[PDB]
Each structure stands twice: as C-alpha cells, then as structure tokens.
Amino acid sequence: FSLNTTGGVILEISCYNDTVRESSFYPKYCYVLYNGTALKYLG
Amino acid sequence: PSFYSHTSVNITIDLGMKLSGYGQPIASALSNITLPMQDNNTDVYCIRSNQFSVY
C-alpha cells in the first residue's frame, strides 16, 4: 500500500522476508516506511 | 510488536534545607530540578523512543 497523507508525506506499508532494523533499509515481516527507512514495526 | 529502543530519563533534584527558629528542618522552595538535555533545553523533555524508564 502506498499512502499519500496530508502535506504530501508519502508512507508505505511494505512486507519483507527478512527483518529490517529501525531507521534502515532492506515468514514475512511488515513495516511502515516514511522515506525508505523503517518507521514502525507491525509484526 | 514494536521496535526496541530504550531511553533512561534521570531527574536531578537539588534540595536546599535550613533550620527554623524552633529547630525544625525547613525545605527551601529554591530547590532545583534538572531534566535530561533535549534541543538545547533542560526544562522540557519528551519521550522519543519506544520504551523508557524514569529515575
């Protein structure tokens, strides 16, 4: 999912096959990405 | 589930004490409170990690 929020901020809901550390870039682990960096871990 | 980042928040309290006329210890209102430094300030501190502890 690619989200366009208020003010033009783009957020993505991306699932990967390997764990991504916080504020970094790349069973499925799902994350919320702000500018290519992991902002929130969903599980 | 969440990311694991921990912050320790230490509050420093410097108390001032005096002896009254009847020998009772009186705590001064001039006691000082110091919070951890954040954005060049030590009077306001907001938690910015996922987990925190206070001391």
Ligand SMILES: *[C@@H]1O[C@H](CO)[C@@H](O[C@@H]2O[C@H](CO)[C@@H](O)[C@H](O)[C@H]2NC(C)=O)[C@H](O)[C@H]1NC(C)=O
């Ligand atoms: C996300 O939405 C914003 C806000 O609508 C889009 O930015 C607009 O882009 C159009 C393109 O013609 C401009 O006319 C507007 O002026 C822009 N708005 C602002 C506030 O700058 C943006 O393109 C969208 N991002 C996408 C679709 O990826």
Ligand SMILES: *[C@@H]1O[C@H](CO)[C@@H](O[C@@H]2O[C@H](CO)[C@@H](O)[C@H](O)[C@H]2NC(C)=O)[C@H](O)[C@H]1NC(C)=O
């Ligand atoms: C709390 O901090 C204030 C401000 O630094 C201290 O008041 C100063 O104390 C020094 C040392 O006696 C004096 O030279 C200054 O003139 C004082 N400043 C003012 C504005 O009064 C105060 O002593 C501290 N209280 C404590 C440590 O209990």
Ligand SMILES: *[C@@H]1O[C@H](CO)[C@@H](O)[C@H](O)[C@H]1NC(C)=O
């Ligand atoms: C995820 O898939 C990629 C592409 O096949 C692979 O290189 C990587 O090792 C995989 N990770 C795990 C933890 O299996």
Ligand SMILES: *[C@@H]1O[C@H](CO)[C@@H](O)[C@H](O)[C@H]1NC(C)=O
């Ligand atoms: C997002 O990442 C790109 C690629 O590194 C970078 O050029 C850009 O400045 C970043 N945007 C923000 C708002 O940090």
Ligand SMILES: *[C@@H]1O[C@H](CO)[C@@H](O)[C@H](O)[C@H]1NC(C)=O
């Ligand atoms: C905060 O206090 C703890 C003990 O409660 C100490 O271990 C830690 O280093 C302190 N953190 C600081 C001063 O940033």
Ligand SMILES: *[C@@H]1O[C@H](CO)[C@@H](O)[C@H](O)[C@H]1NC(C)=O
């Ligand atoms: C205030 O913060 C800036 C960065 O915004 C820093 O460069 C500067 O040293 C700070 N000033 C003081 C007096 O701490």
